[PDB]
């Protein structure tokens, strides 16, 4: 509640607000019979002890205490009554006038000495001439004092400190010391040692800090509070709340100057200002919507293709292929159709693992039965010429392929287990990449193992390439080996190109570009494989 | 260097060191002349007001200047006859008294007022009477009374200032004294009075550079002569802990005002005892012959390879073929290098060789034995129908080449992946305890070695099934009967050893690990290369 006190107390003191926020106005003032006479400073206390008023004030009250100790001598001195002789008058006029030069910050002083008032008053600093005009103890203080007269004038605020002089029934007299405070400032308007101790910060901190984490509204002096004295080297900094990426952020938006407001601004996704274009990369729908619809359509068509094959058996053309083998190939491809749909969402960890788990099993089920079928053809040919036909339809090929499936399962299990152990230390999965324009995007990193899988598929397919080379004169009824040759070479070339491209230009590619390339490669290899191995089964009879 | 000068200054003043070692001294014995006019003051010459020893002296000098300002005001009083009446004489000495009770600590004071001495002085604080005798605030060194003995005072200063006169120099001063007995005597660091910043016998000149963060002070750096009193700052003596390194707390020897040693409690770890906790005990009765014996096994295996190189006839071995038995007798060497490697410190290069050797050795030995056992079965199942497709080296070897390719590939992948996280964490050379707070250096488990443990188990399952198949085939030299043992042994012992090694990972000593490795290696491998070889030179 300390903050609002100043605002509500401004309307009991006309013309004064302009003086605090503009000290120099006094020059043009000819109104206000008497200026401010008493201002409420009790929120921190009656008066700040050990204040931040510099040692100056401490040493001033110390000189006053020494002086009063001096006057606390002749109250009891023997025969020290006299009759106010001229020498005694000189001593009296000197004893406090000396106090002036001992502190650069003491205004006029005086001594009452009621017996003949005999009071003396002095002029300003560095030029002072005495003038004579005809219960409680321990240095009681007082509120700031204003010379009423018929204005306020430049001097403005001075504190009227005083104490008492006891005698041998007190003396009904005191000593007056005045302290100039124009040269001192407020306690940075946020500390706890003066008028505005951790208060008078209208619409800052509590209003701008809780939400704005690390708002830092002060820096060196928050919420310039009253001024009026001067503008010293404390550097009173207003609207200093930066907040970094905080929801309030800089907030250099509106309600500037004394009427501070507009705490909430310049915070969208990253530590920037004035909207959300920075950092986040542009997202399009024309290259992120039709793609998935097309992929789903192709998937559904493949499903219906599997079914129709289930509906055709007696066509001897397929009989050579074998129902089980072709169904396995189609399912392998269907499974291979999930590196794009997975890329359509945010790159989590579960998805970033699902991607490899799908790609590897597909790339092993599809071109792990074509190669074996070519092998079976080659072996049967090389054996028939010498009294032998060992191989047979599904039942041998599938069992042999089970070995490749076992090896792939094993490697994937090892890789998954190893990856979900380092999560305690580092993730190294969901990284951020730049694109030469100070924009960050979230992607999945390279594991240094994918380099190995890329070359593993290449080496494996070399075996199929050699098979293709060997079988070139075998009489075939439906030219199936001729077709599968394309399905092998095409992959050997494309997959290599796509892998190298994806690896080199890895971080320099936005998410949408990655999706485009993935879809391109998938529909340039897998679709060709399905089409080549299937279409020539319902035609060319 | 001021330390050395202070030590020299110690021996130029009789019966004086004991005052700083012990405050009283005169309390038991004070028999000396006017001694202690000046000892060191301050290493940087003097302190006008710098080094800030308590604010009490700040306020003292401030009151001094303030009071002298009064007199400076009473310099050119107009028509000041100053006849020195009873009231005139009263005023000045009343002021002199007044200057007293404004501060806690202060001693006698006096005013000369040379017009006729007119010198007025009083006693210490809280006890003042009147005694008459018959620029820029210059300082002075510590003072002591000289009329007889030394007694209590103990280095009270004699600050004073003068006053000016006009119509020249009045030749008058306002003397004050300050008792410094009740004052903290510096901290022997962070240069102040009587002590510039190191100021003791080898605070760090012998120990700290060896071990940084010595922490000699904590709150009071290597408490110095002191002597004025014992303040509440807890003068810290020999407080330099320094944790590890030779510079330590060093609670060993030479513990006194001269404790220059501070040289101990440094053996391998941040402890004080002799090296023993940091490094577990090593034996030689166990860690020495274990390598000599394995060297002998290796040399015998090499000579046995040669011996087979010198026997090609004796058809008994023809059924196995030179090209294959040689491969086995070589794969064995590779398998024989998990012990010699473990004989040295666990670096990273060695901690990688440990897998590179083991995996290749295995894939060779039980990648050729299994294939031979498969060839026998195939030939048997084929001859019963007109067919003999298989053949010795040239057929088995290329089939084994596939296993070697796969193993090479996996090892390359694993090595590359493990020499990439070294930028962040090493996760290779770790340490563990054994329930008695003992640390030792070992190689940890990669979470991939679990997979390699089960891979060989699955592989040898194929071998055991082969063994189950070939049971009634007529064999000339019972070779399959032999190889069955070589397969089951490594099915069982290998699994047991792997589980034991993995579960008791960190709770096992280094020498204990060496013992277990040697036991396992010589309980399976030797049986393999002795069972497949010995019969070839007997049972003819």
């Amino acid at each position, epitope marked *: 509640d300390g903050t609002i006190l100043a605002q509500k107390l401004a309307e009991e003191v006309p013309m004064d607000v302009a003086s605090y926020l503009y000290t120099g106005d006094s020059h043009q003032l000819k109104r206000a019979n008497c200026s401010g006479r008493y201002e409420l400073a009790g929120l921190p206390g009656k008066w700040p002890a050990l204040a931040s008023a510099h040692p100056s004030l401490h040493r001033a009250l110390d000189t006053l205490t020494h002086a009063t100790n001096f006057l606390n001598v002749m109250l009891q001195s023997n025969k020290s009554r006299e009759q106010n002789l001229q020498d005694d008058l*000189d001593w009296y*006029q*000197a004893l406090v006038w000396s106090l002036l030069e001992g502190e650069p910050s003491i205004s006029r002083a005086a001594i009452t000495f009621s017996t003949a008032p005999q009071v003396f008053l002095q*002029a300003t600093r*560095e*030029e002072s*001439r005495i003038l004579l005009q005809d219960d409680k103890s321990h240095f009681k203080w007082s509120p700031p004092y204003l010379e009423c007269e018929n204005g306020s004038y430049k001097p403005g605020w001075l504190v009227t400190l005083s104490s008492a002089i006891y005698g041998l029934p007190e003396f009904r007299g005191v000593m007056k010391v005045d302290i100039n405070l124009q040269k001192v400032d407020i306690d940075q308007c946020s500390s706890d040692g003066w008028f505005s101790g951790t208060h008078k910060c209208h619409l800052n901190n509590s209003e701008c800090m809780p939400i704005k984490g690390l708002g830092f509204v002060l820096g060196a002096y928050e919420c310039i509070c009253k001024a009026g004295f001067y503008h010293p080297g404390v550097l009173p900094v207003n609207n200093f709340r930066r907040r970094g990426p905080d929801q309030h952020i800089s907030g250099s938006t509106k309600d500037v100057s004394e009427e501070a407001y507009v705490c909430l601004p310049c915070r969208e996704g990253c530590p920037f200002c004035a909207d959300d274009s920075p950092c986040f990369v542009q997202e399009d729908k024309y290259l992120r919507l039709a793609i998935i619809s097309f992929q789903a359509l192709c998937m559904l068509l493949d499903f219906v293709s599997m079914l129709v094959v289930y509906h055709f058996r007696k066509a001897k053309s397929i009989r050579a292929s074998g129902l089980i083998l072709l169904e396995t190939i189609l399912f392998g491809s269907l499974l291979l159709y999930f590196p794009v749909v997975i890329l359509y969402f945010e790159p989590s960890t579960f998805r970033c693992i699902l991607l490899r788990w799908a790609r590897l099993l597909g790339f092993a089920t599809v071109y792990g039965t074509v190669t074996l079928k070519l092998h079976r053809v080659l072996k049967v040919f090389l054996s028939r010429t010498a009294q032998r036909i060992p191989y047979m339809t599904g039942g041998r090929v599938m069992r042999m392929l089970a070995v490749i499936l076992l090896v792939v399962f094993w490697f994937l299990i090892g890789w998954t287990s190893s990856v979900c152990q380092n999560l305690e230390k580092q993730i190294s999965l969901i990284g951020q990449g730049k694109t030469s324009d100070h924009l960050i995007f979230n992607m999945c990193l390279i594991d240094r193992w994918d380099y190995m899988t890329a070359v593993a598929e290449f080496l494996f397919l070399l075996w199929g390439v050699y098979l293709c080379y060997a079988v070139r004169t075998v009489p075939s009824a439906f030219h199936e080996p001729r077709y599968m040759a394309v399905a092998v070479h095409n992959e050997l070339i494309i997959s290599a190109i796509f892998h190298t491209i994806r690896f080199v230009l890895a971080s320099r590619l936005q998410s949408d570009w990655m999706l485009m390339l993935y879809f391109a490669h998938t529909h340039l290899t897998v679709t060709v494989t399905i089409g080549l191995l299937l279409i020539p089964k319902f035609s060319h009879s | 260097d001021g330390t050395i000068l202070a030590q020299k200054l110690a021996e130029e003043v009789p019966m004086d060191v004991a005052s700083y070692l012990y405050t009283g001294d005169s309390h038991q014995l004070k028999r000396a002349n006017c001694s202690g006019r000046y000892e060191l003051a301050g290493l940087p010459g003097k302190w006008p007001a710098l080094a800030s020893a308590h604010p009490s002296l700040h306020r003292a000098l401030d009151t001094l200047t303030h009071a002298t300002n009064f007199l400076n*005001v009473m*310099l*050119q*009083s*107009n028509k000041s006859r100053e006849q020195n009446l009873q009231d005139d004489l009263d005023w000045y000495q009343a002021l002199v008294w007044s200057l007293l009770e404004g501060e806690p600590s202060i001693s006698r004071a006096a005013i000369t007022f040379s017009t006729a001495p007119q010198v007025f002085l009083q006693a210490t604080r809280e006890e003042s009477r009147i005694l008459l005798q018959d620029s820029h605030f210059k300082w002075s060194p510590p003072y002591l009374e000289c009329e007889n003995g030394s007694y209590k005072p103990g280095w009270l200063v004699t600050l004073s200032s003068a006053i000016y006169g006009l119509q020249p120099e009045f030749r008058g001063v306002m003397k004050v004294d300050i008792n410094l007995q009740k004052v903290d005597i510096d901290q022997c660091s962070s240069d102040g009075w009587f002590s510039g910043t190191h100021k003791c016998h080898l605070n760090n000149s012998e120990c700290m550079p060896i071990k940084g963060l010595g922490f000699v002070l904590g709150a009071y750096e290597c408490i110095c002569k002191a002597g004025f009193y014992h303040p509440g700052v807890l003068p810290v003596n020999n407080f330099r802990r320094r944790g590890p390194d030779q510079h330590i707390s060093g609670s060993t020897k030479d513990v006194s005002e001269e404790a220059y040693v501070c040289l101990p409690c440094r053996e391998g770890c941040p402890f004080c005892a002799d090296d023993s906790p940091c490094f577990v005990q090593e034996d030689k009765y166990l860690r020495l012959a274990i390598i000599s014996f394995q060297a002998l096994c290796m040399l015998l295996d090499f000579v046995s390879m040669l011996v087979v190189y010198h026997f090609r006839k004796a058809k008994s071995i023809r059924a196995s073929g030179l090209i294959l038995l040689e491969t086995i007798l070589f794969g064995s060497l590779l398998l024989y290098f998990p012990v010699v490697i473990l004989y040295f410190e666990p670096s990273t290069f060695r901690c990688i060789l440990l897998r590179w050797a083991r995996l290749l050795g295995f894939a060779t030995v039980y990648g050729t034995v299994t294939l031979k056992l498969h060839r026998v079965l195939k030939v048997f199942l084929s001859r019963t129908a007109q067919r003999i497709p298989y053949m010795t080296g040239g057929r088995v070897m290329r089939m084994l080449a596939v296993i070697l390719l796969v193993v090479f590939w996996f090892l390359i992948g694993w090595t590359s992946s493990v020499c990439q996280n070294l930028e962040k964490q090493i996760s290779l050379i770790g340490q563990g305890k054994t329930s008695d707070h003992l640390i030792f250096n070992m190689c940890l488990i990669d979470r991939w070695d679990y997979m390699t443990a089960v891979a060989e188990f699955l592989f040898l399952l194929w071998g055991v099934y082969l063994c189950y198949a070939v049971r009634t085939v007529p064999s000339a030299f019972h070779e399959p009967r032999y190889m069955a043992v070589a397969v089951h042994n490594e099915l069982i012992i290998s699994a047991i050893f792997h589980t034991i090694r993995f579960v008791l990972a960190s709770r096992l000593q280094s020498d204990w690990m060496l013992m277990l490795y040697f036991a396992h290696t010589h309980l399976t491998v030797t049986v393999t290369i002795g069972l497949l070889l010995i019969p070839k030179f007997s049972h003819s």
Partner: nanobody
Amino acid sequence: EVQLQESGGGLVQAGGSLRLSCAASGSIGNIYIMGWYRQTPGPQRELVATIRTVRWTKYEDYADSVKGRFTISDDDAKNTVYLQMNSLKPEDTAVYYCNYKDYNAPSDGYWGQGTQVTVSS
């Protein structure tokens, strides 16, 4: 270091008067001392006057010989420091020099202007 402004021109006889105020424009009032160095070093009828004692309870600095001579005073917050030429004498002819004496003034002070006066019998 104050530019003292002397204004004392005018032809006066014996027994006349004149207010030659060395105003301290660059400073404030009764803080310094005077003593009015003059070109003629041989005044047989006593010397120029001076007043004030810097800051301590302004005192009449006549040397017991100038009391019945040029008289000087101030008005507290009055920088104008005039010296009325009481009982003027023929020797008055000279160039007067108000000066500084407060501090950093070992060999007295210095002047910043010269007034050429002429007095006859």
